[PDB]
């Protein structure tokens, strides 16, 4: 019957207390859906290239891949403001120092397929005929046999807001490109530079269609598609932040002058260099503090803006994210630059789109223009040719110095994960099937080492035009739509913090210059500017 | 025997999270308590009198009443920062929306007492012989048999360092006085002003000692004095302050006119007066905002700075606390004025004393120079005299307002509890014995219906001198002091709050001006600086 | 009560609202606390062209005082009254004319009986939510029957979006289907 | 229904039932609207004070929450003639 | 819900009140003129309380063939007494 | 507390507090001197 509701919009994150502190996070998150058809059935392999980077210089610009554009609509969980209002996951960042992660399951229920017909009036007059019998195509991916695209670093998830209704978008994934854009050259001289994308290998090309991979179910419009509980295996999280470093790793050296007058402006004094004492990594006598005895690095010198070239293309190399220096640098050390749409914060008035350079405060980072390597003696008062620092060109280039090929990670190199991100990060993440696992990953702080979660196809069943559908490339069909609604339910496990100290930390408050950020105005106008996270602190060592 | 310890020091806050959210705040508190000897052993009635008050127009001055000094000294508990570090009373702000009251205990454990004597060399050399067969007296007054004085509200509390030895104050109770301080004048004009303390009357002159009230627990050096564990029977406290006024209570009129610009400078405008409906308080047709139909009123004009005079003498009305107006007036609203000691918060360099006026933030307070009142017809566009502005004088005298007079506590007021105010607000508080109990206490927010929890009383037993004890006023003794240290454990119930909302709510954060308030200097210099309590909002209808 | 007394609150001026009682044999209505509902036209109201109906109503608890009756004295009573001695209501207060002493004087003493609100029919309220504060009032003035507990659930109704072909990220606005609903509702409220 | 009961008491069981035509909300974006008015910005007025601030939601709300609703004056008639006390017991609402 | 059965009814739309922080001062007289400011400010960050509904209460979706069904809910109040009292201070007690 | 405590026989002679702007403890106005008229008491007795 058609006329009997299916399923129950539900949006509340029930913040079950379990015992000895666990708590139990039940999110849920419900959406209107509005899918439209697709406006071609056929898959297309589509090459991408662009003028932009066969001019000399311009190298960074390269947008050119090989993209495989399927009909199917892709329906996205994966981000973290679908299922946390500013609300609870302030009591997040407030209170939790892990958060483990538990179940999932989707749920499409209640659609309505609707056909838009057009009469011959002198306005353009649309009327909204109800399609009872027409069906719309679901496939939950539960084996993840197709490309896992995550629409989360596109930023083209469902809208984080309950009331405003989404978009699904086309799922579509990269095919395999030959790439040719050498000689890499600088942007002043010119040079007989090749961009061309070639054609694509034999032995690796990758056609998945979606109808002969996953079985789909068809859906009339009193349908209740549910996915099953999934039951996640990840890590568990830690939003509490690290602020030890090896300046701050281990026992301070003992001080014989003691300040006196009140005000930290006078300091006091330790003993001299070379009467200290203790384990120490160097041969020379005296014992600083800066080459001391610790257990192991925080962070690593990354090769900062290291354009890599594989069989794809041109790119960056990734950077673990992590807290820059009082200098804010934020290149070398990995920093955010979201840009959103109108369905993710941005407030809806005229303006461009919001940008917000973000970095976690885990204080683990490093600043090029303050590092410098000597010879191998230690030489304090170092010669002029034995110390490198970063004022030197590397090959005749100025601009460019030592830590731009310097590299430091060490066996011994501790490190912080990457941040989740509000609203706009990503929660969960596909293992990469490789040989050698990474030990991170910075899409996502959340990495399953099982199969997945079952990505969700929606695709428009053809309603077909009395118009034949042999020996024709192109068939006619009726316009349509769709308006299913989407519940899911993301299970998370969290622990409550305990304060064992005694100056209180700095909780996620809410200013005076701050409620602007989160409340609507006199149009409608809403925002979901993002939060910095992991504000807890805790002892690395 | 002397050698064997007897307690255990104990200083940590387990915040034990039990189920539903229910949690046990149990609290511990542990501080060594240094008591030195009664200057007199003898009981002394001492009327106070000042002659500042003597002079005309300082009546507000008036320190004079009768004090009973008994030489028995007295181990509080009754205040805040003793059991809660500002690391844990963050987490109290941040996250508890009612706080029950459930258990008590004190110990007082390890004394340690000592002889000092004074040898006749050329600086003046002490030598600290130790008492091994010495006593010192406690008594746990179980049923509260004498009057209950608690320390909190002069800050003669035990110091809210762990670290830092603490004092005891010396128990002293009120006397009935029987005032004479008519006239009341003036400042300018000269009165023939009677001020003494006349003889007390026969009726109600009620001296209590303390050994003919409570048993009292001698204590060798090997000691462990155990008050067992009090339960309380309070009021659940809700931490959660009201924001809703008579101007936010119920529901709001329609609007017809709603705004299409961004931005807050334009306003929707509603209907006409004359047109709206519903039902209303007045005879007149036009239904305004302000006279309007609402449940009760939110606060209650007391009348301010009034100095009610009864047998014991004159002395200002208590007003409920409050958050005041956007103009800050604080004196009708019952502002907070705590003065501290070195024990208490307050950087111990050579400044004097921290003030911090302070105040809820529960919004249910008025402002004096806002109010007015009219004639018994409405009539807008009102008389002149017809409606009483508050520049009218009251009988010619022109800073004096209608308010000063003016009441309005009728039977639907509703009104938010005490704050409780930290570090250095008193937590319990011992019900009125009286006939028409009182609906909240100012000098507490939690109180005890029962019996409240005994209060200790603490003395060096009289180590006598060989001199003859018949026939002399004053006797000699051995000078003498003790360290003894005091256990006890506060064992809280509060429920976690839970955020039905969207936007987040203001926490008690850390800003960068803020860290010098809760970290020590070079000298060792600690403060204890207020926190603006009740943070969490909630609605009131 | 000291009566069409504006409080100020963070929130705004606010008359203080009395408890409505009948009024005296003057008919005063306002420092009795008077109800003057004004309907619409399916609440009441001769659904004819005039503006809408009125009825400045009182119970008939008789426990009401009249400003214009009362007087105050000084502390030894007197009989035969001092000019001085006596505060009628012809006294300014602070020179303003019109207003007596009863507009300021407050009387609610600890021993002050007094009867709740009256129901009114049909445009009253029937219950109210219980004022979550720590001292709860001990009547409400909008609806005379208080629920201790957690007060029944209102009922929220909204039409789902229909939604136009139109695309609905990066808009402000949205078109809809313009559309409406008749739903019956049945309730069934039990006394006793 | 008037169901007397023993001893006096009654059991006033009041139904009601009405069509509730609603029409869809003219914005489903949430509007926090401030409320001003040039009347009390003008000396002397300040009875006249509709200025709030006010949270203006989509969601319509259906009220029982008035007595005509439950009584109509024949039997509200019976109630003032003959009743003493008034308990209040159940509540049920239905949407169908 | 208007309180006749056969005339159908509307239902209003939900709002409620924001936090408003009114600056209206200096209150005057209508006679002489004042420089007073009528302006209502920025909401305080402390108390800004915004309810939206879909993340509050769980939200039933109704085809045209519902029955949406709330439970009976049980009141606990005190009795109200339809008797109004006439004795005064002047009728209270024995008279002389 | 006070600090200036008698020493002769006979109420005529007065215990002397300390001042008014050196006493601490909470209380209920904004000015800095503690008098014990304008002090911090539970509940005001009697009602005018």
Same mark, same amino acid.
């Given at each position: 019957?058609?006329?009997?509701?299916?399923?129950?919009?539900?949006?509340?994150?029930?913040?079950?207390?379990?015992?000895?502190?666990?708590?139990?996070?039940?999110?849920?998150?419900?959406?209107?859906?509005?899918?439209?058809?697709?406006?071609?059935?056929?898959?297309?392999?589509?090459?991408?290239?662009?003028?932009?980077?066969?001019?000399?210089?311009?190298?960074?610009?390269?947008?050119?891949?090989?993209?495989?554009?399927?009909?199917?609509?892709?329906?996205?969980?994966?981000?973290?403001?679908?299922?946390?209002?500013?609300?609870?996951?302030?009591?997040?960042?407030?209170?939790?120092?892990?958060?483990?992660?538990?179940?999932?399951?989707?749920?499409?229920?209640?659609?309505?397929?609707?056909?838009?017909?057009?009469?011959?009036?002198?306005?353009?007059?649309?009327?909204?005929?109800?399609?009872?019998?027409?069906?719309?195509?679901?496939?939950?991916?539960?084996?993840?046999? @197709?490309?896992? /695209?995550?629409?989360?670093?596109?930023?083209?998830? &469902? %809208?984080?807001? *309950?009331? !405003?209704? #989404?978009? =699904? $978008?086309?799922?579509?994934?990269?095919?395999?490109?030959?790439?040719?854009?050498?000689?890499?050259?600088?942007?002043?001289?010119?040079?007989?530079?090749?961009?061309?994308?070639?054609?694509?290998?034999?032995?690796?090309?990758?056609?998945?269609?979606?109808?002969?991979?996953?079985?789909?179910?068809?859906?009339?419009?009193?349908?209740?598609?549910?996915?099953?509980?999934?039951?996640?295996?990840?890590?568990? @999280?830690?939003? /509490?932040?690290?602020?030890?470093?090896?300046?701050? &790793? %281990?026992?301070? *050296?003992? !001080?014989? #002058?003691? =300040? $006196?007058?009140?005000?930290?402006?006078?300091?006091?004094?330790?003993?001299?260099?070379?009467?200290?004492?203790?384990?120490?990594?160097?041969?020379?006598?005296?014992?600083?503090?800066?080459?001391?005895?610790?257990?192991?690095?925080?962070?690593?010198?990354?090769?900062?803006?290291?354009?890599?070239?594989?069989?794809?293309?041109?790119?960056?190399?990734?950077?673990?994210?992590?807290?820059?220096?009082?200098?804010?640098?934020?290149?070398?050390?990995?920093?955010?630059?979201?840009?959103? %749409?109108?369905?993710?914060?941005?407030? #809806?008035?005229? $303006?461009?789109?919001?940008?917000?350079?973000?970095?976690?405060?885990?204080?683990?980072?490093?600043?090029?223009?303050?590092?410098?390597?000597?010879?191998?003696?230690?030489?304090?008062?170092?010669?002029?040719?034995?110390?490198?620092?970063?004022?030197?060109?590397?090959?005749?280039?100025?601009?460019?110095?030592?830590?731009?090929?310097?590299?430091?990670?060490?066996?011994?190199?501790?490190?912080?994960?990457?941040?989740?991100?509000?609203?706009?990060?990503?929660?969960?993440?596909?293992?990469?099937?490789?040989?050698?696992?990474?030990?991170?990953?910075?899409?996502?702080?959340?990495?399953?080492?099982?199969?997945?979660?079952?990505?969700?196809?929606?695709?428009?069943?053809?309603?077909?035009?009395?118009?034949?559908?042999?020996?024709?490339?192109?068939?006619?069909?009726?316009?349509?739509?769709?308006?299913?609604?989407?519940?899911?339910?993301?299970?998370?496990?969290?622990?409550?913090?305990?304060?064992?100290?005694?100056?209180?930390?700095?909780?996620?408050?809410?200013?005076?210059?701050?409620?602007?950020?989160?409340?609507?105005?006199?149009?409608?106008?809403?925002?979901?500017?993002?939060?910095?996270?992991?504000?807890?602190?805790?002892?690395?060592?």
């Amino acid at each position: 019957g058609v006329g009997v509701s299916t399923g129950s919009f539900n949006n509340q994150t029930e913040f079950h207390y379990l015992g000895d502190g666990l708590v139990q996070i039940t999110a849920h998150a419900s959406r209107l859906v509005h899918l439209n058809m697709p406006e071609h059935e056929s898959y297309r392999r589509i090459n991408v290239l662009n003028s932009e980077a066969g001019v000399a210089g311009q190298m960074v610009q390269d947008d050119a891949h090989s993209q495989m554009v399927t009909p199917w609509s892709l329906v996205d969980a994966n981000a973290w403001g679908v299922w946390f209002n500013p609300g609870d996951w302030q009591l997040i960042t407030n209170n939790m120092t892990e958060l483990n992660l538990v179940s999932f399951e989707q749920e499409i229920f209640n659609v309505v397929l609707k056909t838009i017909t057009e009469s011959a009036t002198t306005p353009p007059t649309k009327i909204y005929n109800n399609d009872l019998t027409a069906s719309l195509m679901v496939a939950l991916d539960t084996n993840n046999t @197709l490309p896992y /695209t995550p629409a989360a670093p596109r930023s083209e998830t &469902l %809208g984080f807001y *309950p009331w !405003l209704p #989404t978009k =699904p $978008t086309h799922y579509r994934y990269y095919m395999t490109c030959t790439r040719n854009l050498t000689p890499p050259t600088h942007t002043g001289q010119a040079g007989t530079i090749t961009n061309t994308i070639s054609a694509p290998t034999h032995s690796d090309v990758m056609f998945y269609t979606i109808e002969n991979a996953v079985p789909i179910h068809l859906l009339r419009t009193g349908d209740e598609f549910s996915t099953g509980t999934y039951y996640f295996d990840t890590k568990p @999280l830690k939003m /509490t932040h690290s602020w030890q470093t090896n300046r701050s &790793l %281990g026992l301070p *050296p003992k !001080l014989a #002058t003691e =300040p $006196t007058t009140e005000g930290q402006q006078h300091t006091g004094t330790l003993k001299a260099a070379t009467d200290r004492e203790g384990i120490h990594q160097t041969i020379n006598n005296s014992y600083t503090e800066a080459t001391a005895l610790r257990p192991a690095q925080v962070g690593y010198n990354t090769p900062y803006m290291n354009f890599e070239y594989s069989d794809g293309g041109p790119f960056l190399t990734p950077i673990v994210p992590v807290y820059d220096t009082q200098y804010n640098a934020d290149e070398p050390n990995g920093a955010y630059r979201i840009t959103m %749409g109108y369905q993710h914060g941005q407030i #809806t008035t005229a $303006t461009e789109l919001g940008r917000y350079t973000l970095n976690p405060i885990s204080k683990g980072g490093r600043a090029p223009n303050q590092e410098f390597n000597q010879s191998s003696p230690l030489q304090m008062e170092n010669t002029l040719n034995g110390t490198l620092l970063p004022t030197d060109p590397i090959g005749g280039k100025t601009d460019i110095h030592f830590t731009n090929t310097l590299n430091t990670y060490g066996p011994l190199t501790a490190l912080n994960n990457t941040p989740p991100i509000y609203p706009n990060g990503q929660i969960w993440d596909k293992e990469l099937d490789a040989d050698l696992k990474p030990r991170l990953h910075v899409t996502a702080p959340f990495v399953c080492k099982n199969n997945p979660p079952g990505q969700l196809f929606v695709k428009i069943a053809p309603n077909l035009t009395d118009d034949f559908n042999a020996d024709s490339p192109q068939q006619p069909r009726i316009i349509t739509y769709s308006n299913f609604w989407w519940k899911g339910t993301l299970t998370f496990t969290a622990r409550m913090r305990s304060s064992n100290m005694w100056n209180p930390i700095h909780q996620h408050t809410t200013t005076n210059d701050n409620i602007v950020n989160y409340m609507p105005s006199n149009i409608g106008g809403m925002r979901l500017y993002p939060e910095i996270p992991q504000l807890i602190p805790r002892k690395l060592y």
